Scaffold this motif. Structure first.
Motif, mmCIF file in Angstrom:
data_model
loop_
_atom_site.group_PDB
_atom_site.id
_atom_site.type_symbol
_atom_site.label_atom_id
_atom_site.label_comp_id
_atom_site.label_asym_id
_atom_site.label_seq_id
_atom_site.Cartn_x
_atom_site.Cartn_y
_atom_site.Cartn_z
ATOM 1 N N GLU A 27 0.827 -1.201 0.000
ATOM 2 C CA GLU A 27 0.000 0.000 0.000
ATOM 3 C C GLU A 27 0.865 1.257 0.000
ATOM 4 O O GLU A 27 2.010 1.234 0.450
ATOM 5 N N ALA A 28 0.309 2.352 -0.507
ATOM 6 C CA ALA A 28 1.028 3.619 -0.564
ATOM 7 C C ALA A 28 0.157 4.767 -0.065
ATOM 8 O O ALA A 28 -1.057 4.773 -0.269
ATOM 9 N N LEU A 29 0.785 5.738 0.589
ATOM 10 C CA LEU A 29 0.067 6.893 1.117
ATOM 11 C C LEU A 29 0.020 8.021 0.092
ATOM 12 O O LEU A 29 1.021 8.698 -0.146
ATOM 13 N N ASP A 30 -1.147 8.218 -0.509
ATOM 14 C CA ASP A 30 -1.325 9.267 -1.507
ATOM 15 C C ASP A 30 -1.360 10.643 -0.848
ATOM 16 O O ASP A 30 -1.559 10.759 0.361
ATOM 17 N N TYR A 31 -1.163 11.683 -1.651
ATOM 18 C CA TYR A 31 -1.169 13.050 -1.146
ATOM 19 C C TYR A 31 -2.392 13.304 -0.272
ATOM 20 O O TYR A 31 -2.401 14.217 0.555
ATOM 21 N N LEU A 32 -3.425 12.489 -0.462
ATOM 22 C CA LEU A 32 -4.656 12.623 0.310
ATOM 23 C C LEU A 32 -4.557 11.867 1.631
ATOM 24 O O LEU A 32 -5.566 11.603 2.283
ATOM 25 N N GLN A 33 -3.332 11.527 2.021
ATOM 26 C CA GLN A 33 -3.100 10.803 3.265
ATOM 27 C C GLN A 33 -4.007 9.579 3.360
ATOM 28 O O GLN A 33 -4.352 9.133 4.454
ATOM 29 N N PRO A 74 2.735 -2.396 4.984
ATOM 30 C CA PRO A 74 2.678 -3.815 4.620
ATOM 31 C C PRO A 74 1.251 -4.294 4.378
ATOM 32 O O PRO A 74 0.525 -4.618 5.318
ATOM 33 N N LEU A 75 0.855 -4.339 3.110
ATOM 34 C CA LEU A 75 -0.486 -4.779 2.742
ATOM 35 C C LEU A 75 -0.756 -6.190 3.257
ATOM 36 O O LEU A 75 0.166 -6.989 3.416
ATOM 37 N N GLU A 76 -2.026 -6.488 3.513
ATOM 38 C CA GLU A 76 -2.416 -7.803 4.009
ATOM 39 C C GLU A 76 -1.668 -8.907 3.267
ATOM 40 O O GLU A 76 -1.671 -8.955 2.037
ATOM 41 N N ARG A 77 -1.028 -9.791 4.024
ATOM 42 C CA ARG A 77 -0.275 -10.894 3.440
ATOM 43 C C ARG A 77 -1.213 -11.934 2.836
ATOM 44 O O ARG A 77 -2.319 -12.167 3.324
ATOM 45 N N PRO A 78 -0.764 -12.574 1.745
ATOM 46 C CA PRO A 78 -1.548 -13.599 1.050
ATOM 47 C C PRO A 78 -1.682 -14.880 1.868
ATOM 48 O O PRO A 78 -1.286 -14.928 3.032
ATOM 49 N N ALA A 79 -2.241 -15.915 1.249
ATOM 50 C CA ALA A 79 -2.424 -17.196 1.920
ATOM 51 C C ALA A 79 -1.297 -18.163 1.573
ATOM 52 O O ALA A 79 -1.155 -18.582 0.423
ATOM 53 N N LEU A 80 -0.497 -18.514 2.574
ATOM 54 C CA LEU A 80 0.620 -19.432 2.375
ATOM 55 C C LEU A 80 0.119 -20.835 2.047
ATOM 56 O O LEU A 80 -0.412 -21.533 2.911
ATOM 57 N N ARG A 81 0.296 -21.242 0.794
ATOM 58 C CA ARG A 81 -0.137 -22.562 0.352
ATOM 59 C C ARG A 81 -1.403 -22.995 1.088
ATOM 60 O O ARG A 81 -1.450 -24.070 1.685
ATOM 61 N N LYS A 82 -2.426 -22.148 1.040
ATOM 62 C CA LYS A 82 -3.692 -22.441 1.701
ATOM 63 C C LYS A 82 -4.068 -23.910 1.530
ATOM 64 O O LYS A 82 -3.854 -24.494 0.469
ATOM 65 N N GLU A 83 -4.630 -24.499 2.581
ATOM 66 C CA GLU A 83 -5.035 -25.899 2.545
ATOM 67 C C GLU A 83 -6.344 -26.067 1.777
ATOM 68 O O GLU A 83 -7.362 -25.472 2.126
ATOM 69 N N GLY A 84 -6.307 -26.883 0.727
ATOM 70 C CA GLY A 84 -7.493 -27.114 -0.074
ATOM 71 C C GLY A 84 -8.246 -25.834 -0.379
ATOM 72 O O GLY A 84 -9.338 -25.608 0.143
#
Length: 88
Positions: A27-33, A74-84
Motif C-alpha cells: 500500500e502507498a500513502l497518496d497526497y490525500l493521506q 505492509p499490505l495484508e499478506r496472502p495465503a501461504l499454500r492455503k489448505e485445499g
C-alpha cells in the motif's frame, strides 16, 4: 532526536511486513493521506526511486515513489499454500 537511514538505506531495511521488490503488492500513502493497494513495477537502486502503480485511480495511474519515503505500509499478506483452496 535521532536520525538513521544510514545502513544502506537504498536496500530494504529490517521491515517485518513491507518488502521492496519487483511486482510486490503493498500500500502507498497518496497526497490525500489515504491508504490504498499498489505494486512495484520497477526499482531504481542507483537513484532510490521505484515505479509504483495505484489501483484506486481507475485509469492505470503509476508514479515513482522513493522507496525511502516511508509512506508505504505492509499490505495484508496472502495465503501461504492455503489448505485445499477449492472444494469441487
Amino acid at each position: 532526536g535521532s536520525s538513521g537511514s544510514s545502513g544502506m538505506s537504498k536496500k530494504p531495511p529490517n521491515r517485518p511486513g513491507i518488502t521492496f521488490e519487483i511486482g510486490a503488492r503493498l500500500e502507498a500513502l497518496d497526497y490525500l493521506q489515504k491508504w490504498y493497494p499498489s505494486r512495484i513495477e520497477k526499482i531504481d537502486y542507483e537513484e532510490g526511486k521505484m515505479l509504483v502503480h495505484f489501483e484506486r485511480w481507475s485509469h492505470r495511474y503509476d508514479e515513482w515513489i522513493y522507496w525511502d519515503s516511508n509512506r508505504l505500509r505492509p499490505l495484508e499478506r496472502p495465503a501461504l499454500r492455503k489448505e485445499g483452496l477449492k472444494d469441487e
